[PDB]
Amino acid sequence: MAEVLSLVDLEIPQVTDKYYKFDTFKHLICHLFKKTSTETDSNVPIVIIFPTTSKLDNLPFSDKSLLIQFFFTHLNILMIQGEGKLYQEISSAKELLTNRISRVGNWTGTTHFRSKIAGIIPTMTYILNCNATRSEIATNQLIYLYRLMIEEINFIELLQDASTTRLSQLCYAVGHWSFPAHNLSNDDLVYCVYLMIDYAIKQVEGFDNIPLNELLAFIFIVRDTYKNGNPFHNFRHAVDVLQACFHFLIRLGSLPKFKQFVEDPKLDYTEVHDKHTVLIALKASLNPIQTLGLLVAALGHDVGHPGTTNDFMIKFSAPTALLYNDRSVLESYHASLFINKVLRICWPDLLTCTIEEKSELTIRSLIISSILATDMGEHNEYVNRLKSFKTILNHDNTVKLISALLIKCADISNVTRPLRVSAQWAMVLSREFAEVELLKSVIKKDIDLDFTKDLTYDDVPHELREILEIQPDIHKGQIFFINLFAENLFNSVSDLLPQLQYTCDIIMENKLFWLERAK
Numbered sequence: 001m002a003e004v005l006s007l008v009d010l011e012i013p014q015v016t017d018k019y020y021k022f023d024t025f026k027h028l029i030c031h032l033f034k035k036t037s038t039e040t041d042s043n044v045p046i047v048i049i050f051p052t053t054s055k056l057d058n059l060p061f062s063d064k065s066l067l068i069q070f071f072f073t074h075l076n077i078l079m080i081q082g083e084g085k086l087y088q089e090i091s092s093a094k095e096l097l098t099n100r101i102s103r104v105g106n107w108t109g110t111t112h113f114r115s116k117i118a119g120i121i122p123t124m125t126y127i128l129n130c131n132a133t134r135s136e137i138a139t140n141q142l143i144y145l146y147r148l149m150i151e152e153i154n155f156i157e158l159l160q161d162a163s164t165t166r167l168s169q170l171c172y173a174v175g176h177w178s179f180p181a182h183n184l185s186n187d188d189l190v191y192c193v194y195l196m197i198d199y200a201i202k203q204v205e206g207f208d209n210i211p212l213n214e215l216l217a218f219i220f221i222v223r224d225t226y227k228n229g230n231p232f233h234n235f236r237h238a239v240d241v242l243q244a245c246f247h248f249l250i251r252l253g254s255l256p257k258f259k260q261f262v263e264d265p266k267l268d269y270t271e272v273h274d275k276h277t278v279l280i281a282l283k284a285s286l287n288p289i290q291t292l293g294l295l296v297a298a299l300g301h302d303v304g305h306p307g308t309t310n311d312f313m314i315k316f317s318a319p320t321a322l323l324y325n326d327r328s329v330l331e332s333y334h335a336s337l338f339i340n341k342v343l344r345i346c347w348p349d350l351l352t353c354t355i356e357e358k359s360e361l362t363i364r365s366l367i368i369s370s371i372l373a374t375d376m377g378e379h380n381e382y383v384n385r386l387k388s389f390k391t392i393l394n395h396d397n398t399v400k401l402i403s404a405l406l407i408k409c410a411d412i413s414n415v416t417r418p419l420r421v422s423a424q425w426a427m428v429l430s431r432e433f434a435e436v437e438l439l440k441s442v443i444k445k446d447i448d449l450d451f452t453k454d455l456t457y458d459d460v461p462h463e464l465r466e467i468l469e470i471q472p473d474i475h476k477g478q479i480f481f482i483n484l485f486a487e488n489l490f491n492s493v494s495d496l497l498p499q500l501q502y503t504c505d506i507i508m509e510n511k512l513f514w515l516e517r518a519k
């Protein structure tokens, strides 16, 4: 029934599937951080058994509990410290967690018929509320626990392959416009984020450089807010959007080029490496701090995404849709979580920076603005505000608009990647859409699923041919989306920012191919 993690000799075989005994709280924590390295949602309840030199290991139970509750909320944990109430709680949680469609229903609050659910499973409203109402004292204690983990956990060791060869490969992967996101593990992707954010931080003048371990801790925490079982809106998508923004900013001159940068965006990915394990560097619209703010916003722009759409949340009266009055439902959620859960604890000093010495506009506000701009329901207004701007805004609102436009472009950049990679994204987006349709049918009682089994997928094919064979008609989704959203956005942005014209070039190349096989 449950995965049991113990710091003591007690056994609870009545509810135990697999039991892990840990010598230290630090090693238990490391086990938990690695759970988001996989491609699947954790689908079993986790019981942690506590007792009735390391600072982590010697924390009072109140602080150990606070750490687990806050940093590992996503893992469906029940904490005990030495039968009927336990068994029923775990049994109920297991019944609700096993199946993907059940999990999405739980998180979104749309399958009530089927606080934390069973005291264990978090919902979007629970997490949103917890982070909005947290006291100053609680906030400072979490900051202390975070710094404690940075002090005592060597995060590079939590990646499966941190060899010199692999790290160099990732530098070159980051350098390709044909970013091979689907060939990178969630561990690989963590290092990719480090490469890009570290590179950006180094360009910011009045701003200290942050050690490898501290950046990695932050990124592990970000990864932990994405749902690994989302076929599309997962940490891979976050890093991909970050990487697209990264390329945009390099090509606009907001960041310098680096030795591993691949100049020609139309090339497919080739696996390259050398002896370097970080990016080696060689007026712009956005200055160094705005550039960093944008990249950070891209990283966090879908945090906590439950694998649905605004339309689903609105039409099925999801609690978060009710909170947000149907207005930018998921994006409001992402912005609130990213700021109040992640950045407030992990990087509070970034939130209080301003976009320039003269400006009162904070990086917090810029991040919020940019994240909110990714709502496709507001797509037309950002396009019109761009066309009005091209034909006036003060500096602050100019920075907001440019940032908004770049993050919008990055968010839907899968259609501007070279065909093969673009097709892989199309396929996983189709998987997620199919899950949403299944969830709707479950809620409407148009289908009865076996909730004792989980949804599993074969790997995304490497080659375009196999993708087209697995689902022909991929073309019509791409044609629809390019005609109604992408073409107009990238053309308009490239008119303002000529360096991004290559995006329009690739879109057309892809469109012509999709139109070809429509015939």
Ligand SMILES: CC(C)Cn1c(=O)n(C)c(=O)c2nc[nH]c21
Pocket (backbone or CB within 6 Å): 309, 376, 411, 412, 413, 414, 415, 426, 429, 477, 478, 481
């Ligand atoms: C977020 C989503 C509804 C928008 N959307 C879409 O509908 N299709 C078909 C795509 O290929 C796509 N790529 C990014 N966003 C996309």
Ligand SMILES: [Mg+2]
Pocket (backbone or CB within 6 Å): 301, 302, 330, 331, 374
């Ligand atoms: Mg989004």
Ligand SMILES: [Zn+2]
Pocket (backbone or CB within 6 Å): 237, 241, 301, 302, 374, 411
């Ligand atoms: Zn997104």
